[PDB]
Amino acid sequence: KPKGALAVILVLTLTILVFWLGVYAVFFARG
Amino acid sequence: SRVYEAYPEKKATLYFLVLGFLALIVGSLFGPFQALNYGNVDAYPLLKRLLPFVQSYYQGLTLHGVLNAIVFTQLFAQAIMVYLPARELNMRPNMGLMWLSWWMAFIGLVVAALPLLANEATVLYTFYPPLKGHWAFYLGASVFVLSTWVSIYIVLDLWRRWKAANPGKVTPLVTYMAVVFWLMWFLASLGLVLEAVLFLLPWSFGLVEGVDPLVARTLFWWTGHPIVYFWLLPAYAIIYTILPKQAGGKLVSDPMARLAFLLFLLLSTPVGFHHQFADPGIDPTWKMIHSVLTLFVAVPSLMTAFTVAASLEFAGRLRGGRGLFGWIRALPWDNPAFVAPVLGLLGFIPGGAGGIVNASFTLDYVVHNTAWVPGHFHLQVASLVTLTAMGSLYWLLPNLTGKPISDAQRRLGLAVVWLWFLGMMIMAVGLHWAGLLNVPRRAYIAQVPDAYPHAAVPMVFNVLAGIVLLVALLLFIYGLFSVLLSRERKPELAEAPLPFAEVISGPEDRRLVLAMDRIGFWFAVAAILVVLAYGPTLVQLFGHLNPVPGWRLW
Amino acid sequence: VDEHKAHKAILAYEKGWLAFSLAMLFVFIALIAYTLATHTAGVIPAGKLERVDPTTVRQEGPWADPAQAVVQTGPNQYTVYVLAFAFGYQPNPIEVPQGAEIVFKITSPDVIHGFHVEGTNINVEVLPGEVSTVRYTFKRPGEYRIICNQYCGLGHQNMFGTIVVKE
Numbered sequence: 008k009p010k011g012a013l014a015v016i017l018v019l020t021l022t023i024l025v026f027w028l029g030v031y032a033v034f035f036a037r038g
Numbered sequence: 039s040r041v042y043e044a045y046p047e048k049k050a051t052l053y054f055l056v057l058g059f060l061a062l063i064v065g066s067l068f069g070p071f072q073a074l075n076y077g078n079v080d081a082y083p084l085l086k087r088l089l090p091f092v093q094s095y096y097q098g099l100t101l102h103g104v105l106n107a108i109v110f111t112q113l114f115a116q117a118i119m120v121y122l123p124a125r126e127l128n129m130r131p132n133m134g135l136m137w138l139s140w141w142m143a144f145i146g147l148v149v150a151a152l153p154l155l156a157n158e159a160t161v162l163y164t165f166y167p168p169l170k171g172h173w174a175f176y177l178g179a180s181v182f183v184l185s186t187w188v189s190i191y192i193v194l195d196l197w198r199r200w201k202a203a204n205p206g207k208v209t210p211l212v213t214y215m216a217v218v219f220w221l222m223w224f225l226a227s228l229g230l231v232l233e234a235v236l237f238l239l240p241w242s243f244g245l246v247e248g249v250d251p252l253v254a255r256t257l258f259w260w261t262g263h264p265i266v267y268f269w270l271l272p273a274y275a276i277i278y279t280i281l282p283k284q285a286g287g288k289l290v291s292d293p294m295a296r297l298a299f300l301l302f303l304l305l306s307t308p309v310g311f312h313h314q315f316a317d318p319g320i321d322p323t324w325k326m327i328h329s330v331l332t333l334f335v336a337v338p339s340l341m342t343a344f345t346v347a348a349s350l351e352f353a354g355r356l357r358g359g360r361g362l363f364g365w366i367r368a369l370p371w372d373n374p375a376f377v378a379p380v381l382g383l384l385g386f387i388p389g390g391a392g393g394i395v396n397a398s399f400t401l402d403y404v405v406h407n408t409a410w411v412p413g414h415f416h417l418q419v420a421s422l423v424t425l426t427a428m429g430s431l432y433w434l435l436p437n438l439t440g441k442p443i444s445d446a447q448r449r450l451g452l453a454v455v456w457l458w459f460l461g462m463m464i465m466a467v468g469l470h471w472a473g474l475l476n477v478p479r480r481a482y483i484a485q486v487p488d489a490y491p492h493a494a495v496p497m498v499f500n501v502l503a504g505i506v507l508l509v510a511l512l513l514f515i516y517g518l519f520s521v522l523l524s525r526e527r528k529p530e531l532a533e534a535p536l537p538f539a540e541v542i543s544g545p546e547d548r549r550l551v552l553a554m555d556r557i558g559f560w561f562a563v564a565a566i567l568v569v570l571a572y573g574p575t576l577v578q579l580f581g582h583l584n585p586v587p588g589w590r591l592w
Numbered sequence: 593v594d595e596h597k598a599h600k601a602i603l604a605y606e607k608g609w610l611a612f613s614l615a616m617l618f619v620f621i622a623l624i625a626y627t628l629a630t631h632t633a634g635v636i637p638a639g640k641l642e643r644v645d646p647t648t649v650r651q652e653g654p655w656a657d658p659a660q661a662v663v664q665t666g667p668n669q670y671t672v673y674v675l676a677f678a679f680g681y682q683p684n685p686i687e688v689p690q691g692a693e694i695v696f697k698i699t700s701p702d703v704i705h706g707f708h709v710e711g712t713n714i715n716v717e718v719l720p721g722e723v724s725t726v727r728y729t730f731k732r733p734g735e736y737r738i739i740c741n742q743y744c745g746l747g748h749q750n751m752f753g754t755i756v757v758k759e
């Protein structure tokens with residue numbers, strides 16, 4: 008099984024969520 | 039040489055490539071100075087001594103955007119997405135047309151460049167009315183871009199001739215990629231062509247008094263989103279069909295590669311209101327629809343991430359790497375051809391994350407028109423696309439010229455690629471972080487040194503990135519001209535085949551490929567989506583035109 | 593065999609990844625939809641087309657006298673007619689009470705400018721011939737800076753304004 012490929016898509020997913028939720032929070036702080 | 043008699047397409051390709059890199063060099067000269075600016079250091083008095091035709095920061099910015107983002111990327115697209123399918127099919131393209139395309143490109147460039155150099159079109163690469171450039175700028179830009187319609191013809195011609203000789207056979211993988219690529223571009227290109235023909239040209243010649251800026255922006259961003267996928271897809275083609283061989287493995291799936299390109303055909307054009315979330319006069323309902331479709335255009339790159347990572351893991355295991363991370367160490371990190379796009383892909387993770395934030399309608403109000411945005415896009419085009427193009431010096435250039443790459447030139451190449459990548463990453467931190475502090479894009483901030491005190495720390499990252507990327511550019515110039523001007527030739531290199539990867543196949547794959555090969559159908563679906571996504575708003579805007587007078591404020 | 597078993601396993605996980613991806617994208621759509629149903633959505637520009645003539649806007653109508661640009665249109669609502677021009681904003685300052693809904697109506701007599709209120713989600717493009725309408729309620733009193741964040745010529749980097757929110 009492609010464990011390595013899975014580690015890469017895990018890293019990508021965490022990056023997407025940190026970006027998105029961090030900006031969602033900034034949006035509500037300024038609203 | 040007798041090699042260009044057999045394969046004249048090698049010479050034309052080379053001309054596209056060299057012209058493209060000259061453009062990249064001249065446009066990139068302005069980058070370090072713009073980075074230092076975003077570090078609160080004003081180095082423009084020195085730049086004006088070196089280049090006395092430069093009158094302002096914003097003229098330098100216009101040259102940077104036009105030469106790097108419009109010119110270099112188009113010429114790379116035209117070189118890669120004509121020559122690669124030609125070599126896969128082993129058929130010669132219509133050489134009359136191929137030379138015609140090069141001459142259109144070159145003439146349009148020269149014509150556009152003159153007012154840029156004379157300070158007559160300091161309007162940036164988006165050229166938003168009612169800021170009014172010189173007519174030669176719009177005429178030249180229009181002829182440069184239309185050059186691509188001839189490339190579209192050339193590849194459809196190749197594809198048709200192959201089908202006539204091979205009836206009942208499915209389109210080969212690289213040629214399938216190029217056909218859907220160029221068909222996508224035809225649809226995409228209509229926004230800008232319409233803007234130029236109906237509005238910018240008659241206006242710049244004096245034939246009409248004003249232009250409606252809202253309809254102009256709307257037509258612009260029809261083309262303005264899918265143009266960035268136009269920049270990207272040539273690197274993807276290389277990453278899917280060439281990089282796996284260079285890594286020591288194979289492409290793990292033909293159908294998944296085809297599906298990603300197909301989704302780009304369908305979803306790249308009907309989304310441009312994501313560039314207009316802050317525009318008046320466009321209904322919020324339509325903004326949401328375009329926001330939703332923009333999140334879907336993310337899927338083919340999400341898909342790409344898995345398919346390519348799995349291909350590289352496969353190569354890594356074939357070369358004896360074990361465990362979670364040992365497959366990485368076993369990859370050929372001594373080959374600049376392998377290293378450059380892979381570093382590109384790493385930086386594309388934060389780059390894509392920023393893109394998804396930008397797409398999310400109301401979240402865009404946090405980051406719109408701040409330094410965040412150039413942070414996002416330098417990770418995408420100035421890193422992945424550019425680095426992929428830089429790596430092709432090391433396999434494509436010998437295949438075109440017969441000139442070998444020396445071991446010293448290889449080593450130099452590895453340094454250039456790492457410094458470029460590290461430079462972009464450092465800048466990305468500074469620009470992203472400055473953007474969150476409300477520092478605007480498109481601004482000579484160094485000339486107002488007390489205006490953004492809260493951003494002192496991210497500014498240090500911008501200075502540093504400035505000097506690192508200056509060193510990388512200088513080393514690149516030196517390296518490019520060492521390869522080109524080198525005396526030694528070896529015609530056996532020019533006659534060798536391209537390093538196309540093999541594919542792993544499954545019983546599943548043929549049923550999927552046939553459905554995807556119905557290109558007439560898929561093209562029709564993509565056209566209808568553009569009409570539904572754009573039609574209702576354009577009918578409303580053309581009904582209520584309010585043209586306004588032009589201004590020159592430089 | 594080795595390669596066929598690899599094709600099969602890779603594809604099996606990829607289908608999972610794709611399903612997860614779609615799920616994540618759908619959750620973001622729901623969370624965006626939520627913002628459109630709250631007060632924070634007031635910063636989305638009105639979609640109505642409201643045409644004006646940029647050549648007469650300093651001579652006639654609601655933008656011609658900046659000292660009368662702040663107008664009570666509701667019991668806790670004020671409308672502000674703002675001019676963004678080369679290179680400044682009028683009125684300067686913009687004075688408004690805290691806790692009231694403020695409707696900004698912004699136009700330009702020349703080129704496109706930005707209107708970005710530092711510390712808020714107000715971040716709107718301003719086009720000549722067209723009125724940009726956005727709504728916001730200021731919670732904290734004090735001075736907020738307006739930044740032109742669209743390139744508008746050589747004075748762009750020095751084009752700032754001020755809002756004062758009174759207790």
Ligand code: HAS
Pocket residue numbers: 015019164266267269270312313332333335336339340342343344346347350366380383384386387389390391392393394396397398402405406407411414415418419423
């Ligand atoms: C090539 C150039 C570009 C690409 C690609 C691109 C992608 C996106 N962008 Fe964008 N962008 C926007 C949204 C997106 C979205 C949703 C995506 C998506 O397509 C991105 C999806 C990408 C991913 C989901 C990443 C996949 C990750 C991969 C593929 C890496 C895997 C790594 C591996 C396999 C390596 C592993 C190897 C080992 C050894 C470990 C929005 C709004 O929605 C704005 C307007 C913002 C504003 O307010 O002005 C915007 C603005 C821009 C502008 C500025 C225009 C201007 O001047 O005003 C440019 C030039 C640009 C370029 C590009 N952008 N973008």
Ligand code: HEM
Pocket residue numbers: 066068069070072073076099100102103106107110111162163164412416419420424478479480481482503504507508511
């Ligand atoms: C040494 C390399 C580079 C450096 C240091 C650099 C730096 C910069 C900086 C700091 C900005 C923002 C300036 C502003 O908003 O006022 C900028 C804008 C830009 N850069 Fe680069 N850049 C480089 C290479 C590239 C490349 C290779 C591309 C494209 C292939 C590119 C495309 C752009 C574009 C499209 C803009 C936006 C122009 C505009 O807003 O009108 N850059 N660059």
Ligand SMILES: CCCCCCCC/C=C\CCCCCCCC(=O)OC[C@H](O)CO
Pocket residue numbers: 035619622623626630
């Ligand atoms: C396998 C498990 C299946 C179930 C998985 C379900 C996933 C649900 C995700 C998000 C919920 C949306 C939350 C909507 C409420 C948001 C409230 C909020 O964010 O409040 C901020 C601010 O204070 C207000 O103005």
Ligand code: CUA
Pocket residue numbers: 677679704705706740741742743744745747748749751
């Ligand atoms: Cu007004 Cu920039």
Ligand SMILES: [Cu+2]
Pocket residue numbers: 262263264266310312313
């Ligand atoms: Cu876009």
